[PDB]
Structure 1
Amino acid sequence: SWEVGCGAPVPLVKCDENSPYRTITGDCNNRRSPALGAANRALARWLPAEYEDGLALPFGWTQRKTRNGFRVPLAREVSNKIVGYLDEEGVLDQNRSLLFMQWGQIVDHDLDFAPETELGSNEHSKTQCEEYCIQGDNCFPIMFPKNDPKLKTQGKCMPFFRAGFVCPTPPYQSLAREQINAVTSFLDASLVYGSEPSLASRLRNLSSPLGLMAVNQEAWDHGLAYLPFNNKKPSPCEFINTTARVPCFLAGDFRASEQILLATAHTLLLREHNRLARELKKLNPHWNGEKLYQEARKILGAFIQIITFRDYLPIVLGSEMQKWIPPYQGYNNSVDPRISNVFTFAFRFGHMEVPSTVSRLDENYQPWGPEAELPLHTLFFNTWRIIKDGGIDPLVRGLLAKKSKLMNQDKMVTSELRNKLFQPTHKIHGFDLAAINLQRCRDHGMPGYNSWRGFCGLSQPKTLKGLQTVLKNKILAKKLMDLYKTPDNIDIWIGGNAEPMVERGRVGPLLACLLGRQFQQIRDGDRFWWENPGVFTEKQRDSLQKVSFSRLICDNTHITKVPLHAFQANNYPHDFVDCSTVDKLDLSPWASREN
């Protein structure tokens, strides 16, 4: 029946109709249905959850209950036999910079986050999911297949805890278990400011009346601000170099310090806030903090929307962009603005775009110091390499002049993430991002590959040759069906990402359909989208259309040469221009007079 009710881990929020800015939580964006898009609600289902028992237990749970008549292959076996590779030569994308990979993680972290259940803290369950590898409740461990090298050096499993879900959190029964989205579904810069108002206030400098964002007081980057430290322990950023004991950064997203370039990108966005806030004050000295914060928070929001929709999505989706994301026709309040559960896996295409090294580049874009180049795995929850070894300018340079990994059917995920992922809670650089994603698809009751081909109106192959024709890869198709036995059983993550790339893009048909459809929804379903008439003056909107990631860098670093298109492959000095050449974001149209 109409179980439209279910939702009692939530207060619900009286909406002040006339309010001219967004909520932190995303409530009230939709007037008829205010909870839509808002953080700490269920991920939308584009298709019914598919669970071993049609309730919550994930496929592969019971050593006995098949899927369509076959055992599901161990997550890690799939990783080992399909996802892995050795030779990092020839893998880099000759036309996408590292910034391409980085903006994908930024946009993702803005849109969706299903955290693990935090019941299991104040409990041994953490430690003997770890050691004993005993599957129970929300401990869903990743078992190693026969002849797995980790069998020798790491024990029997890598640990894994199930995603948080709505209404209950420990107790029984489900209409069908729906995982939570802990951040606002609207592309709203929620990774900068927060999705809970608790954390949002905590990120603000309320001392000044300038509605500035809080900055580091311990340490500075040639005068330019850093994020404030998360001063609460344990800190996995302390754990990786105790000598340095430099904690993780505090941002509106929990994951800001997962890797050193995400915290770099976060730090550019913060400075952009305070830059905007204290520039408005010059222009409009009467405006209090609450109006400096919100009016700068409103511009950062739109910057992200422009860069995403004008520069990112076009070079991800390619041929397929215009079919899914045609010109803006205005707010449709009948559009579902929610992130879907499948999208949180479609957007994980990013993982095959991450290369095995990160470089630091001097003012002539040459190797900075004698360890200019570092293995990615040494940069998980690494904040000290920024604070005690050069700042962000050397790191932002690499972002511009180093390349993304090109996704590759026989070189899918670098060993840096497939074998040497660091998890915040555990103690080894020993985890497998790829096997994690596969385990997680099952945890979330993901429909198989063909259900989603069906969904997007593409062929549902049932044969080895049917699958050879789609993946355009005799060996990949052979390897997949040796594991899954039917294309119906192939986990959506590796299904989507196995397809060749659509033209002038970096995803195959299935993922372009899933991704395109969600960004279409994120735009059309937002009352506060920057092009939506009313939100901005005409004069503001012509002055916002000239933003660039190039611009953002020039204004928030001591870097002076930048490419005109920061996402394509740009070599120094040919493709780099001076900063007096880009186009500033002019805020003349933001002048409040008086009465």
Structure 2
Amino acid sequence: SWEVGCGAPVPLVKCDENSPYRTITGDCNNRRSPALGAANRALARWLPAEYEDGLALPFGWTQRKTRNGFRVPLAREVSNKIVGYLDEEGVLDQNRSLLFMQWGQIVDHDLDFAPETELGSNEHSKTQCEEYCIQGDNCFPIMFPKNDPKLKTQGKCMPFFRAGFVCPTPPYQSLAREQINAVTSFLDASLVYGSEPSLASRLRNLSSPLGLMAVNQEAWDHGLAYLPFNNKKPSPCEFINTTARVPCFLAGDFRASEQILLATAHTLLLREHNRLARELKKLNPHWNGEKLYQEARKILGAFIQIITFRDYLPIVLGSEMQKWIPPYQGYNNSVDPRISNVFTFAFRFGHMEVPSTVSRLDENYQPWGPEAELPLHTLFFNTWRIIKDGGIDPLVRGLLAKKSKLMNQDKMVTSELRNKLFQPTHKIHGFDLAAINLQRCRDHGMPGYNSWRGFCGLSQPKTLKGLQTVLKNKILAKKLMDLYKTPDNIDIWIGGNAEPMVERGRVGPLLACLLGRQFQQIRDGDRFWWENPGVFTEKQRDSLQKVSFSRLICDNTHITKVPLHAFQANNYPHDFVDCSTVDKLDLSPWASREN
């Protein structure tokens, strides 16, 4: 087993070891090594980090140091020549609904977080980085290339701050830099409940004994709950419209209000928890507050694992699925459940799946109002469109009836994200998610594209010709070589995403390998995997299998018509059946009798 040797993060856990419930922090999953998988620990290294100075400085930090003999190209330049595109027509995925993209972001946030080095609300360098673009300490700005139109209109660079690492916050440490994962590595709904003791508590309704999550008191959605608002007044959600003055939502994960659809999904899960608590109180009038909380919780966690492994991964991994994820043989305590550093870049393939617009549909799945179709960028940190413009039902119908954006090698990331991204700490719509992804790739000391190809037993092109055959694209290969001068230097994020998709999947060979391995490990190394004998009863498990996102919509919204397979593309009304024709969740196996 493993756990630590330099650790400092959450204090003071002891453990029970007879407890049938996961801890909040992730500790004590593995009995041999209690900290394996816990939040606030280093992300795992499947390969040694690769920094300019070999310890902490990212490639591209020092102007005349090379990576294997060549200058690494500016992040924003790669964004401009390879990732961008203008024409949104013919870009949609004919067989993946908007929910496909959205579930990905959910699983993701449940698995990893690498927050920025924070270092003060007192600091002036938060504007020495912003206002002047001076590289230094944890300001590692994204410079604009010449001829970039943002030069003429936004300044000389885009703010950026290196991610946090273990040990500190301020200075530095001995050995090599390791970024922190602020959330638990186990699929366990930590995005609903929180990853800290702290926060998990603030989220609960501890005045009633019903094991419920606190809800909004200021507003309701046709009698259905909304997530509570957040405290911190320099609120970004208030900024995007100081007239509506509606603050961001407060959830188990801090990014829950990043974009209106992620908040919508968070809301659906909060509602499911409260609903499972009320019905559980019905079956067992004697269970106390803690017991109701933990049980509903345990439930929701299994639900997220079931939709993820049964409905989601097969249509991501395609025919590579069984090659990486075998059928389940049981808990294996030898497996390292930790999320690796590289996974957090591989799982970013989802950014190439976000379309440029979001729609609100009415009860008939017809355009909801005048302005029903909105540009994605006006929805970053937008909570007022939910509270002051229809509830979540409009938005949920769009999730089912619209499609995701299909990855394409000539159209990669939509301009709504590539030029108009809104960062919570700054004031403009005008950031580039693609460039940021690239800069972070380097901030985290990632090995290049060929190290990972090697790692996955895949060929390593060393020439233009070789790269063309792997990418099956002459022109993209030319653009990559002109910017990188050697495939060894291709940042893993762009390289992994530039590969053609595997059969029946939505990612290429490299990514399928990286994703497949990680997912096999968090299942196999999770003592509380829903299928691990003893976690649930066979009766509960039998009951556990009829879950479906569609059902979920039926019990928690006022939508009455849903598709049966929500992840594939579905046309209204042909594919939409009546909610009462959908398998329900039979709770009877949770009934406990004293004798």
* TM-score, L = length of structure 2: 0.99
Secondary structure at the aligned position of 1:53 is classed as coil
Listed one character per residue, the Cα deviations across residues 151-181 of structure 1 (whole Å, up to 9, x for unaligned) are: 0000000000000000122223431100000
Cα offset for 1:268? 0.3
Contact kept, 8 Å, 1:56 with 1:174, in 2: the verdict is no
Structure 1: gaps (5+ residues):
none
- Which residues of 2 match residues 190-269 of structure 1 at below 5 A? 190-269=190-269
Contact kept, 8 Å, 1:422 with 1:429, in 2: the verdict is yes
Secondary structure at the aligned position of 1:171 is classed as coil
Instruction: Please give the alpha-carbon distance, in whole angstroms, between the structure 1 residues aligned to 2:172 and 2:263.
Output: 39
Instruction: Please give the alpha-carbon distance, in whole angstroms, between the structure 2 residues aligned to 1:379 and 1:147.
Output: 29
Instruction: Please give the alpha-carbon distance, in whole angstroms, between the structure 2 residues aligned to 1:255 and 1:30.
Output: 28
Instruction: Please give the alpha-carbon distance, in whole angstroms, between the structure 1 residues aligned to 2:184 and 2:100.
Output: 23
Cα 1:173–1:203 shift into 2, 3 Å? closer
Contact kept, 8 Å, 1:531 with 1:541, in 2: the verdict is yes
Instruction: Please give the alpha-carbon distance, in whole angstroms, between the structure 1 residues aligned to 2:240 and 2:172.
Output: 39
Instruction: Please give the alpha-carbon distance, in whole angstroms, between the structure 1 residues aligned to 2:506 and 2:3.
Output: 39
Contact kept, 8 Å, 2:353 with 2:404, in 1: the verdict is yes
Deviates more, 1:163-172 or 1:451-460: 163-172
Instruction: Please give the alpha-carbon distance, in whole angstroms, between the structure 2 residues aligned to 1:9 and 1:544.
Output: 35
What residue in structure 1 maps to residue 420 of structure 2?
A: 420
| Alignment of 1:359 onto 2:352 | no
Contact kept, 8 Å, 1:92 with 1:403, in 2: the verdict is yes
Contact kept, 8 Å, 1:72 with 1:484, in 2: the verdict is yes
Instruction: Please give the alpha-carbon distance, in whole angstroms, between the structure 1 residues aligned to 2:185 and 2:295.
Output: 20
Contact kept, 8 Å, 2:118 with 2:169, in 1: the verdict is no
Instruction: Please give the alpha-carbon distance, in whole angstroms, between the structure 2 residues aligned to 1:404 and 1:538.
Output: 36
Instruction: Please give the alpha-carbon distance, in whole angstroms, between the structure 1 residues aligned to 2:411 and 2:219.
Output: 40
Listed one character per residue, the Cα deviations across residues 271-301 of structure 1 (whole Å, up to 9, x for unaligned) are: 0000000000011000001000000000000
Cα offset for 1:484? 0.6
Contact kept, 8 Å, 1:75 with 1:435, in 2: the verdict is yes
Cα 1:101–1:145 shift into 2, 3 Å? same
Instruction: Please give the alpha-carbon distance, in whole angstroms, between the structure 1 residues aligned to 2:366 and 2:388.
Output: 20
Cα 1:210–1:3 shift into 2, 3 Å? closer
Listed one character per residue, the Cα deviations across residues 322-343 of structure 1 (whole Å, up to 9, x for unaligned) are: 0111111000000000000000
Cα offset for 1:3? 11
| Alignment of 1:532 onto 2:532 | yes
Cα offset for 1:232? 1.8
Cα 1:531–1:3 shift into 2, 3 Å? closer
What residue in structure 1 maps to residue 69 of structure 2?
A: 69
Cα offset for 1:233? 1.3
Cα offset for 1:5? 1.4
Secondary structure at the aligned position of 1:205 is classed as coil
Secondary structure at the aligned position of 1:335 is classed as coil
Deviates more, 1:8-17 or 1:344-353: 8-17
Cα offset for 1:2? 11
Cα 1:2–1:329 shift into 2, 3 Å? closer
Cα offset for 1:8? 1.9
Cα offset for 1:25? 0.2
Listed one character per residue, the Cα deviations across residues 45-95 of structure 1 (whole Å, up to 9, x for unaligned) are: 010000000100000000000000000000000000000000000000000
What residue in structure 2 maps to residue 117 of structure 1?
A: 117
Identical columns (%): 100
Cα 1:2–1:566 shift into 2, 3 Å? closer
Structure 2: gaps (5+ residues):
none
Cα offset for 1:15? 1.3
Secondary structure at the aligned position of 1:450 is classed as helix
Secondary structure at the aligned position of 2:78 is classed as helix
Instruction: Please give the alpha-carbon distance, in whole angstroms, between the structure 2 residues aligned to 1:299 and 1:209.
Output: 19
Contact kept, 8 Å, 1:26 with 1:184, in 2: the verdict is yes
Cα offset for 1:121? 2.4
Deviates more, 1:157-166 or 1:120-129: 120-129
List, as ranges, runs of 4+ consecutive aligned residues in structure 1 with deviation greater than 4 Å.
1-4
Cα offset for 1:12? 4.5
Secondary structure at the aligned position of 1:94 is classed as strand
Listed one character per residue, the Cα deviations across residues 191-246 of structure 1 (whole Å, up to 9, x for unaligned) are: 00000011001000001000100000000001000000002211100000100000
Deviates more, 1:229-238 or 1:63-72: 229-238
Deviates more, 1:117-126 or 1:447-456: 117-126
Instruction: Please give the alpha-carbon distance, in whole angstroms, between the structure 1 residues aligned to 2:172 and 2:24.
Output: 32
Contact kept, 8 Å, 2:4 with 2:35, in 1: the verdict is no
Contact kept, 8 Å, 1:25 with 1:184, in 2: the verdict is yes
Listed one character per residue, the Cα deviations across residues 299-322 of structure 1 (whole Å, up to 9, x for unaligned) are: 000000000000000000011000
Secondary structure at the aligned position of 2:580 is classed as coil
Secondary structure at the aligned position of 1:96 is classed as strand
Secondary structure at the aligned position of 2:129 is classed as helix
Listed one character per residue, the Cα deviations across residues 479-523 of structure 1 (whole Å, up to 9, x for unaligned) are: 001001000000000010000000000000000000000000010
Cα offset for 1:346? 0.3
Cα offset for 1:4? 4.6
Secondary structure at the aligned position of 2:128 is classed as helix
Contact kept, 8 Å, 1:561 with 1:577, in 2: the verdict is yes
Contact kept, 8 Å, 1:85 with 1:411, in 2: the verdict is yes
What residue in structure 1 maps to residue 41 of structure 2?
A: 41
Secondary structure at the aligned position of 1:127 is classed as coil
Contact kept, 8 Å, 1:36 with 1:338, in 2: the verdict is yes
Cα 1:253–1:381 shift into 2, 3 Å? same
Secondary structure at the aligned position of 2:581 is classed as coil
Instruction: Please give the alpha-carbon distance, in whole angstroms, between the structure 1 residues aligned to 2:72 and 2:3.
Output: 32
Contact kept, 8 Å, 2:2 with 2:33, in 1: the verdict is no
Cα offset for 1:384? 0.2
RMSD across aligned positions (CA): 1.2
Instruction: Please give the alpha-carbon distance, in whole angstroms, between the structure 2 residues aligned to 1:2 and 1:544.
Output: 32
Secondary structure at the aligned position of 1:547 is classed as coil
Contact kept, 8 Å, 1:256 with 1:266, in 2: the verdict is yes
Cα 1:2–1:205 shift into 2, 3 Å? closer
Secondary structure at the aligned position of 1:479 is classed as helix
Cα 1:2–1:182 shift into 2, 3 Å? closer
Listed one character per residue, the Cα deviations across residues 116-157 of structure 1 (whole Å, up to 9, x for unaligned) are: 011142110101100100000010100000100000000000
Contact kept, 8 Å, 2:3 with 2:35, in 1: the verdict is no
Contact kept, 8 Å, 2:550 with 2:564, in 1: the verdict is yes
Listed one character per residue, the Cα deviations across residues 252-277 of structure 1 (whole Å, up to 9, x for unaligned) are: 00000000000000000000000000
Contact kept, 8 Å, 2:2 with 2:36, in 1: the verdict is no
Listed one character per residue, the Cα deviations across residues 531-564 of structure 1 (whole Å, up to 9, x for unaligned) are: 0000000000001100000000000000001000
Deviates more, 1:201-210 or 1:13-22: 13-22
Cα 1:2–1:248 shift into 2, 3 Å? closer
Instruction: Please give the alpha-carbon distance, in whole angstroms, between the structure 2 residues aligned to 1:163 and 1:117.
Output: 5
Contact kept, 8 Å, 2:3 with 2:33, in 1: the verdict is no
Cα 1:2–1:342 shift into 2, 3 Å? closer
Instruction: Please give the alpha-carbon distance, in whole angstroms, between the structure 1 residues aligned to 2:65 and 2:250.
Output: 44
Secondary structure at the aligned position of 1:126 is classed as coil
Secondary structure at the aligned position of 2:319 is classed as helix
Listed one character per residue, the Cα deviations across residues 447-473 of structure 1 (whole Å, up to 9, x for unaligned) are: 000000000010110100100000111
Contact kept, 8 Å, 1:9 with 1:168, in 2: the verdict is no
Contact kept, 8 Å, 1:55 with 1:173, in 2: the verdict is no
Contact kept, 8 Å, 2:3 with 2:36, in 1: the verdict is no
Instruction: Please give the alpha-carbon distance, in whole angstroms, between the structure 2 residues aligned to 1:174 and 1:594.
Output: 57
Instruction: Please give the alpha-carbon distance, in whole angstroms, between the structure 2 residues aligned to 1:309 and 1:339.
Output: 17
